[PDB]
């Protein structure tokens, strides 16, 4: 679909069999979700933003259905201010910026 | 133009006379530029992201040309790790997310 930006570009996603609301973020290299449980092994990681860095859990090759489109990639879980869908998954669903 | 998300969506922008590279960020409500000595009155503000909040200076009605497309609005200046174009301006240039 085509999504304008007058409001935050939030969409529903399916992950680990659960539904969640996430933000399509072209300013994020990776995808980070609020604290939650995900199957498989994870590795401690760190990522930074405007306020500095935070510690996250890195899960690899995780399937995520984003607004109807399928992706399978790295998903970081930690104290993010909001569920963020980054470029690593945005590219997989063929998402682009247009103007 | 159409910007893919394989790499960070950086574009050239013109502001306060200067030319710089900035990230088209759909996950940012506001526009934040790395410290720059802009003239004019400003108001103190606090903006947050991953890692926490930072103090910035808010300037209103500032002209910003994005990749040739003219816009004008609120611009925040502070210790951000990158020049960021938020939705307040992206909507003005008719930028959309498409997949």
């Amino acid at each position: 679909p085509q999504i304008t930006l007058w409001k935050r570009p939030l969409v529903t996603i399916r992950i680990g069999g659960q539904l969640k609301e996430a933000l399509l973020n072209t300013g994020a290299d990776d995808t980070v979700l609020e604290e939650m449980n995900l199957p498989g092994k994870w590795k401690p990681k760190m990522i930074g933003g405007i306020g500095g860095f935070i510690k996250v859990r890195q899960y690899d090759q995780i399937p995520v259905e984003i607004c109807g489109h399928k992706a399978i990639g790295t998903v970081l879980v930690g104290p993010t201010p909001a569920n963020i869908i980054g470029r690593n998954l945005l590219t997989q669903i063929g998402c682009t910026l247009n103007f | 133009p159409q910007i893919t998300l394989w790499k960070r969506p950086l574009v050239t922008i013109r502001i306060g006379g200067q030319l710089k590279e900035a990230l088209l960020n759909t996950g940012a409500d506001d526009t934040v530029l790395e410290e720059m000595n802009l003239p004019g009155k400003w108001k103190p503000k606090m903006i947050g992201g991953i890692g926490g909040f930072i103090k910035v200076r808010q300037y209103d009605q500032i002209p910003v040309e994005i990749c040739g497309h003219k816009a004008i609005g609120t611009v925040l200046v502070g210790p951000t790790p990158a020049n960021i174009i938020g939705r307040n301006l992206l909507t003005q240039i008719g930028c959309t997310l498409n997949f």
Binding site: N25, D30, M46, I47, I84, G86 | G27, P81, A82, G86
Partner: peptide, 10 residues
């Protein structure tokens, strides 16, 4: 308000 910029994993 919220400016969710996110760098590379570290």
């Amino acid at each position: 308000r919220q400016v969710n910029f996110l760098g590379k994993i570290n």
